[PDB]
Amino acid sequence: DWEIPDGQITVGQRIGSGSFGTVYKGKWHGDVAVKMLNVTAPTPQQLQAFKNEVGVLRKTRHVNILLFMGYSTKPQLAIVTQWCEGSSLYHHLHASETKFEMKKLIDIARQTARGMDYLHAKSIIHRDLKSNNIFLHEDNTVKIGDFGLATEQLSGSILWMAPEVIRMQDSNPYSFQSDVYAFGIVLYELMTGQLPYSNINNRDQIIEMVGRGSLSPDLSKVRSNCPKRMKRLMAECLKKKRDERPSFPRILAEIEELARELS
Amino acid sequence: DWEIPDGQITVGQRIGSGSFGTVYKGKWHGDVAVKMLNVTAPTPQQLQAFKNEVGVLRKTRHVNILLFMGYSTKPQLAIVTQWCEGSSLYHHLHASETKFEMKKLIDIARQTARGMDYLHAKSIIHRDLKSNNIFLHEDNTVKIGDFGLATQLSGSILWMAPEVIRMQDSNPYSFQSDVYAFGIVLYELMTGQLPYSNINNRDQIIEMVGRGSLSPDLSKVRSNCPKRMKRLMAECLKKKRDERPSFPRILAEIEELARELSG
Ligand SMILES: C[C@@H](NC(=O)c1ncnc(N)c1Cl)c1ncc(C(=O)Nc2cc(C(F)(F)F)c(Cl)cn2)s1
Ligand SMILES: C[C@@H](NC(=O)c1ncnc(N)c1Cl)c1ncc(C(=O)Nc2cc(C(F)(F)F)c(Cl)cn2)s1
């Protein structure tokens, strides 16, 4: 039972504010981060999202996954995790434009693959893996999490739903292969320093063209010192078909093998 | 269910042998440490000690406590934790040649109090807190555990409280016994030496401390030691258990002292 009684957490400075809840830096046996769900009376949808996100964080115990520490119910639905200093991988590659050596770029990819492999081993799909959700604790240790913001109908309405209405309410595209594709884009950001489709103006094109197998990230933007296995591993992780993308076991294996060759 | 099936962990080079079994550096979604009980037929006594140590490590989820990751039963009773680089606090203060600044010495005391408070909050008694069981992961993050051989001992007496020397059963182990152990750690941090370093043999240190006739020489503290620390150290080394403060009020004054130096 990881429930934290009301009165122990010392809510401090606010970190952000999303469509789900607000996040503060709290005091609880040290520095922690608390996502207070702005629900004085959570709806069953919001309550289920709370029980789902805590139920997933319970099964995680890894160096490269964000350390879950506890949750609260009174007087606000809250989730308490460790407090990490630094910035997100998106902030270092696309906002600050910090130059990482090729040694560290592979190390960040290795730790990310380590955390992702532990999730898939525990039968956990990230569903929203991106460089913004890859926090660099102390600018060294990679911490994977879901810092998201926007986190029944298939029952009483089923006798009247047309067949084509059921082609969109029983398909779950989120799978281990979808997380592999997300990891492939992260490899693109690490090895190119840019976001994919950087020459496209709007997102209306990027959505329809990528989903139809007509648009793929320009792999020629990789650095000159990029290892030839990284560009090949990146391409296999960005295959249009889901089955053609490799699994994280053999992904982490090739990255860790490349890491030991780089001194 | 944190049990790791047989065949996923790649046991590697032997590092040491602590607690019950020997400890190796293993491969399991990254670098991990595995303590395998090398007994093909463990006695129920050894099995119960295994079930107790995992039952306590399950209840731990803190930045300054060693991350438990899983256990094994086939073909050997094993415990899998994270793999941390660096050395123990005992190695840094009495073996290594580097002197830690007073800023970092207070930070090590803060992280130790943070981890110890989290243990006592979870109703967990360490029973054997000492600078040898305080690992400095990456020479920065303090990790508290029950190792044995991290990096003949003899001195494993110096952290036992006076009432712990008048043995009864499993009653002298209490939160006050761990507070006394923390006081000895404060002595090592603020003096750079072990307590009773001027005593020839161990025949005196055991009977004299247990009879309230021997206490660590507080005049051996450094000149730049804050006066708040010397008072907190003395109260943590009181002969009576009730006169020693609790880690809440211990961690409170340490973090309060830390913010006066960090700004
Ligand atoms: C309170 C807030 N903590 C911070 O924001 C924070 N923490 C450290 N350092 C900072 N600078 C900041 Cl700012 C958070 N509470 C829950 C968070 C979370 O990620 N849950 C989660 C994780 C997963 C994962 F398994 F993929 F990991 C999934 Cl699948 C689904 N949900 S994050
Ligand atoms: C597998 C082996 N790991 C290592 O040895 C190791 N790990 C990282 N880096 C290294 N260089 C090494 Cl060498 C371990 N398995 C269980 C360990 C342990 O401490 N259990 C424990 C913890 C507590 C606590 F609550 F106080 F935390 C208590 Cl009260 C009682 N028992 S340690």
CSV table of N, CA and C in Angstrom, one decimal, chain A residues 2 27-31 57-63 67-69 82 114 117-118 121-122 138 252 256, chain B residues 2 27-31 57-63 67-69 82 114 117-118 121-122 141 251 255:
chain,number,residue,atom,x,y,z
A,2,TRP,N,0.9,1.9,-1.1
A,2,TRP,CA,1.8,3.1,-1.3
A,2,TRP,C,1.0,4.4,-1.1
A,27,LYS,N,7.8,18.4,-0.6
A,27,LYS,CA,8.7,17.8,0.4
A,27,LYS,C,8.1,16.6,1.0
A,28,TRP,N,8.7,15.5,0.9
A,28,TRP,CA,8.3,14.2,1.5
A,28,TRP,C,9.5,13.3,1.6
A,29,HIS,N,10.2,13.3,2.8
A,29,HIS,CA,11.4,12.6,3.0
A,29,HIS,C,12.4,13.0,1.9
A,30,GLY,N,12.5,14.3,1.6
A,30,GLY,CA,13.4,14.8,0.6
A,30,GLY,C,12.6,15.6,-0.5
A,31,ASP,N,13.2,15.7,-1.7
A,31,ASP,CA,12.5,16.4,-2.8
A,31,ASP,C,11.8,15.4,-3.6
A,57,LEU,N,2.5,2.6,-12.7
A,57,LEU,CA,3.7,3.0,-12.0
A,57,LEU,C,4.1,2.1,-10.9
A,58,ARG,N,3.2,1.3,-10.4
A,58,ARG,CA,3.5,0.3,-9.4
A,58,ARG,C,4.4,-0.8,-9.9
A,59,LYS,N,4.2,-1.2,-11.2
A,59,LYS,CA,5.0,-2.3,-11.8
A,59,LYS,C,6.3,-1.9,-12.3
A,60,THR,N,6.8,-0.6,-12.0
A,60,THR,CA,8.0,-0.1,-12.5
A,60,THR,C,9.0,0.0,-11.4
A,61,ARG,N,10.2,-0.7,-11.5
A,61,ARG,CA,11.3,-0.6,-10.6
A,61,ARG,C,12.6,-0.7,-11.4
A,62,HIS,N,13.0,0.4,-12.0
A,62,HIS,CA,14.2,0.4,-12.9
A,62,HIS,C,14.9,1.8,-12.8
A,63,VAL,N,16.2,1.7,-13.1
A,63,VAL,CA,17.1,2.9,-12.9
A,63,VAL,C,16.7,4.0,-14.0
A,67,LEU,N,11.0,7.0,-10.9
A,67,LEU,CA,10.7,6.3,-9.6
A,67,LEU,C,9.3,6.8,-9.1
A,68,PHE,N,8.3,5.9,-9.1
A,68,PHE,CA,7.1,6.2,-8.4
A,68,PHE,C,7.3,6.0,-6.9
A,69,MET,N,6.7,6.9,-6.1
A,69,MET,CA,6.9,6.9,-4.7
A,69,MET,C,5.7,6.8,-3.9
A,82,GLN,N,9.9,10.8,-7.6
A,82,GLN,CA,11.1,11.5,-7.3
A,82,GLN,C,11.2,12.8,-8.0
A,114,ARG,N,17.1,0.9,-22.5
A,114,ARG,CA,17.0,0.1,-21.2
A,114,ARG,C,15.6,0.3,-20.5
A,117,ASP,N,12.8,-1.2,-22.7
A,117,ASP,CA,12.8,-2.7,-22.7
A,117,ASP,C,12.2,-3.2,-21.4
A,118,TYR,N,12.5,-2.5,-20.3
A,118,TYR,CA,11.9,-2.9,-19.0
A,118,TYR,C,10.4,-2.8,-19.0
A,121,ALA,N,9.0,-5.6,-21.2
A,121,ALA,CA,9.1,-6.8,-20.4
A,121,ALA,C,8.0,-7.0,-19.4
A,122,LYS,N,7.7,-5.9,-18.8
A,122,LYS,CA,6.5,-5.8,-17.8
A,122,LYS,C,5.2,-5.7,-18.6
A,138,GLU,N,20.1,15.2,-13.8
A,138,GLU,CA,21.4,15.6,-13.5
A,138,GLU,C,22.3,15.6,-14.8
A,252,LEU,N,18.1,-2.9,-27.8
A,252,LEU,CA,19.0,-2.6,-26.7
A,252,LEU,C,20.3,-3.4,-26.8
A,256,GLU,N,23.8,-1.4,-26.9
A,256,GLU,CA,24.9,-1.6,-25.9
A,256,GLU,C,26.1,-2.2,-26.5
B,2,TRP,N,7.1,-9.7,-8.4
B,2,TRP,CA,8.4,-9.2,-8.8
B,2,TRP,C,9.4,-10.3,-9.2
B,27,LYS,N,23.3,-8.9,-15.9
B,27,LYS,CA,22.7,-8.2,-17.1
B,27,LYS,C,21.2,-8.5,-17.0
B,28,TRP,N,20.4,-7.4,-16.9
B,28,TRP,CA,19.0,-7.6,-17.0
B,28,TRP,C,18.4,-6.2,-17.3
B,29,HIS,N,18.1,-5.9,-18.6
B,29,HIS,CA,17.7,-4.6,-19.0
B,29,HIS,C,18.6,-3.5,-18.6
B,30,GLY,N,19.9,-3.8,-18.6
B,30,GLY,CA,20.9,-2.9,-18.2
B,30,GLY,C,21.8,-3.5,-17.1
B,31,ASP,N,22.5,-2.7,-16.3
B,31,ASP,CA,23.4,-3.2,-15.3
B,31,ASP,C,22.6,-3.4,-14.0
B,57,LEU,N,12.4,-4.9,1.2
B,57,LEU,CA,12.8,-4.2,0.0
B,57,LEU,C,11.6,-3.8,-0.9
B,58,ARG,N,10.5,-4.6,-0.9
B,58,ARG,CA,9.3,-4.3,-1.6
B,58,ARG,C,8.7,-3.0,-1.1
B,59,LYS,N,8.7,-2.7,0.2
B,59,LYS,CA,8.1,-1.6,0.8
B,59,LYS,C,8.9,-0.3,0.6
B,60,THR,N,10.1,-0.4,-0.1
B,60,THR,CA,11.0,0.8,-0.3
B,60,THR,C,10.8,1.3,-1.7
B,61,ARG,N,10.6,2.6,-1.8
B,61,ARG,CA,10.6,3.3,-3.1
B,61,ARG,C,11.0,4.8,-2.8
B,62,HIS,N,12.3,5.0,-2.8
B,62,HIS,CA,12.9,6.2,-2.4
B,62,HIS,C,14.2,6.4,-3.2
B,63,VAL,N,14.6,7.7,-3.3
B,63,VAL,CA,15.8,8.0,-4.1
B,63,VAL,C,17.1,7.6,-3.4
B,67,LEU,N,17.5,0.5,-4.9
B,67,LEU,CA,16.3,0.2,-5.7
B,67,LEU,C,16.3,-1.4,-5.8
B,68,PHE,N,15.3,-2.0,-5.1
B,68,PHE,CA,15.0,-3.4,-5.4
B,68,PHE,C,14.3,-3.5,-6.7
B,69,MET,N,14.7,-4.6,-7.5
B,69,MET,CA,14.2,-4.8,-8.8
B,69,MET,C,13.5,-6.1,-9.0
B,82,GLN,N,19.5,-2.6,-8.4
B,82,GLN,CA,20.2,-1.8,-9.3
B,82,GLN,C,21.7,-2.0,-9.1
B,114,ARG,N,17.3,11.5,4.8
B,114,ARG,CA,16.1,11.4,3.9
B,114,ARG,C,15.8,9.9,3.7
B,117,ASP,N,14.6,8.4,7.2
B,117,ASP,CA,13.3,8.8,7.5
B,117,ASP,C,12.2,8.0,6.7
B,118,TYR,N,12.5,7.8,5.4
B,118,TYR,CA,11.6,7.0,4.6
B,118,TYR,C,11.5,5.6,5.1
B,121,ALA,N,9.4,5.8,8.3
B,121,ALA,CA,8.0,6.1,7.9
B,121,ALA,C,7.3,4.8,7.4
B,122,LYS,N,8.0,4.0,6.6
B,122,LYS,CA,7.5,2.7,6.2
B,122,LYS,C,7.6,1.6,7.3
B,141,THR,N,25.0,10.6,-5.2
B,141,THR,CA,23.8,10.1,-4.7
B,141,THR,C,24.0,9.0,-3.6
B,251,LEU,N,16.0,15.1,10.2
B,251,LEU,CA,16.1,15.6,8.8
B,251,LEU,C,15.6,17.0,8.7
B,255,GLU,N,18.1,19.6,6.7
B,255,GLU,CA,17.7,20.3,5.5
B,255,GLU,C,17.6,21.8,5.8
